[PDB]
Amino acid sequence: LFPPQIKVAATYMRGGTSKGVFFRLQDLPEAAQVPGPARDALLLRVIGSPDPYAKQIDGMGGATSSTSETVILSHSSKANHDVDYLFGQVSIDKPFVDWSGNCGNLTAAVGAFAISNGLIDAARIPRNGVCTVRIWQANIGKTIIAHVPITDGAVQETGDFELDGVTFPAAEVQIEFMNPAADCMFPTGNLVDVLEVPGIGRFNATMINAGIPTIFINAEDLGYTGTELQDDINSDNAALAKFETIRAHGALRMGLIKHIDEAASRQHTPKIAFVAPPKSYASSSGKTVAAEDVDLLVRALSMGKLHHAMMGTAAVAIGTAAAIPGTLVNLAAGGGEKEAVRFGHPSGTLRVGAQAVQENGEWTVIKAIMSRSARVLMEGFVRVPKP
Amino acid sequence: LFPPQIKVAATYMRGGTSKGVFFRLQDLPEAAQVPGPARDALLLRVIGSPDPYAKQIDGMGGATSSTSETVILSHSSKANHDVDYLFGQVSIDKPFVDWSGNCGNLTAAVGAFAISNGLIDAARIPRNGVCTVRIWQANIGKTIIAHVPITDGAVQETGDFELDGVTFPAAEVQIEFMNPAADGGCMFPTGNLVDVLEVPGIGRFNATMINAGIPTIFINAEDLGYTGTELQDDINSDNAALAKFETIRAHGALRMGLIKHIDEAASRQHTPKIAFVAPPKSYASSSGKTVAAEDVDLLVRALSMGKLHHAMMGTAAVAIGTAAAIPGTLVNLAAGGGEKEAVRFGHPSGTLRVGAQAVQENGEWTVIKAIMSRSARVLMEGFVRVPKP
């Protein structure tokens, strides 16, 4: 006989409320330097998947969607970009890596990794200040900007900026998702649709493609209040099944898939989320989120479970939808023109800015913005058995 | 002024059904090279604790007891030992690292780490074959042996040996826990093979309390209304059940003499362990595989740090094998009674075989050793980072 494990240079990082394994493209084994089965098999093995035990005890994964994540970065040859970014959502249970979406939380870590690993021109890095990293999000074909603080020519990781869902403070990293609307913001052409879901019921829904394709429904239409924590939903098999059926049909209605059964393998996109007007609740850390602290409540699912905080991509979808009068998100937030919203999720709150402009009946959004943070947890070499 | 993070050389490994962060003593910052608050603070931050979110998203931990684990290894000064092993169980919710126990699953990884990191006399490492690593378990003062395979002067990590609860095969590493009975000491601190554990207002529970591998309270599944086939989802979302187990564990700790006041159990979470046992019965494991009644001698489920464990703690496996070898314990009786040189028990992830050699001496039981096979592999090697202490 059994050959030794191979070593692959890698960095394990927290970005926002997620953890991922990061690779320079050139550090991957040659076979994995192009998309396909060899790359996917390698990433699966690094993470510890597929795992019928659902624990990822034999890999780098943490057995949750927000800890079963891989990133491949390279210097970009594209005009006006520094770094090319591929995000792979590694299935816990299936031998599958999903490449259909971005990861918003890891974006801050992408910027930092790029700087620390020479993927941006040295001339673009100030000695002290803020380095603006232009990221080509290669999964979805979008520009994202990470403003990473620099001290003495190196990434400033540590700091006093707090994120709800991140245990310890770190340096603030401002992110900007440019032109988030898919090249349509509303695939159905409607702000709100009646989603026909065979076997479940009829649901008013806003389906938006900004940040990530997302289906928003009202909490009350599912018997929820919007203050739910993970334990209220993630042990409820019937409830989880209801959510998945809706997501599948939404995917079809959005024209993301050609047929309903594609949703079985395509778990990662679209996302499904429920919204509610402000209401006070204790977050997962025990801290009180007061109704006055937020504009609305949003809970989202990822890979079949209620997410512990909020996906960064879904935060973009929330901010963008809130800015367009008449979406379910906008209405949950009290209606009107909104240039930003702070929403309550299970771990606390998150503020996203998105200014929309109307001209000739159409709504456009130049960018959605939010702050995150990132830090290296471990750097060196991951090992897997010889492929 | 927010200084850069410090870097500490470390290796992240799977050992058995657990993951932990491993350090050579000499690689630690000076202040952390002795037991104390500086060491504990470093390890807490590496793992991502204390974490009110209970997710450990800001460290190396995986938000379960079997993935919130640290190990410090050093050259031994003990006669006939190669390496000293300290295990730190890192609390998820409190700023606390518990040093009162061993970790059995990580023992195979300890052997491998020691060989790979210059802690073993080169004369004892063959170019090819088996390196017998003599480990001084410094938490509990016991000898443990790891037979680590060697190829081309390096640890042979990969192989075809499978463990239930470990996703992928690897090289078999046989482990031997020498003289596992404690010197709340003695093999049976109450002096009885079975006791009646009185928990006023909660129940009366027949129990075997044994100190071998780790102090452990065994009760019969049926006395709790369980069958022994339970999986994590049957217990870990049941706050009533978890509270009941904790009260029983506290009363067992008091009865064993491990604590003097019942309230001490709140801070002393790591030891003793509590487990429940039953005769063989068929069930689907957490992976979906059927464990047939014929495949096992008994069923055992254990809790660790207030949750049903996903597989079995290696220390508790030693307690199971040892108790099973002593005729009349609840474990022995669940396995059909009589002398028993080994048992295969069913846990939530499948089965585990443990052998324990019990021999009479002066009309009293002695247990020479307990043995089992595990495996280990490096997951990531390099440097962990934390903000400057």
Residue numbers in the entry:
A (entry chain B): 5 to 187, 194 to 397
B (entry chain A): 5 to 187, 192 to 397
Paper text:
The 2-methylcitric acid cycle (2-MCC) is widely distributed route of propionate catabolism in microorganisms. That is, some prp operons lack the 2-methylcitrate dehydratase prpD, but rather contain two other genes, acnD and prpF. AcnD has aconitase-like activity, whilst PrpF has aconitate isomerase activity. That is, in organisms that use the AcnD/PrpF enzymes instead of PrpD, 2-methylcitrate is dehydrated by AcnD to 4-methyl-cis-aconitate, which is then isomerized to 2-methyl-cis-aconitate by PrpF, and rehydrated to 2-methylisocitrate by aconitases.
Previous crystallographic data identified residues C107 and K73 in the active site of SoPrpF as likely to be involved in catalysis. To further understand the roles of residues K73 and C107, we solved the three-dimensional crystal structure of Apo-SoPrpFK73E, which crystallized in space group P21 with cell dimensions a = 51.8 b = 103.4 c = 78.1 Å, and contained two monomers per asymmetric unit. SoPrpF assembles to form a homodimer and buries 2400Å2 of surface area per monomer, which represents 15% of each monomer’s total surface area. While the SoPrpFK73E variant structure can be superposed closely with both the apo-PrpFWT and trans-aconitate bound structures with rms differences of 0.6 Å and 0.4 Å over 385 α-carbon respectively, an alignment of the N-terminal domains from residues 5–185 reveals that the C-terminal domain of the SoPrpFK73E structure rotates into a more open conformation. Similarly, a malonate molecule derived from the crystallization solution was bound in the active site of the SoPrpFK73E structure. Because malonate is larger than glycerol and smaller than trans-aconitate, the C-terminal domain adopted an intermediary conformation. Attempts to obtain substrate complexed SoPrpFK73E crystals by co-crystallization or soaking into apo crystals with either trans-aconitate or 2-methylcitrate were not successful.
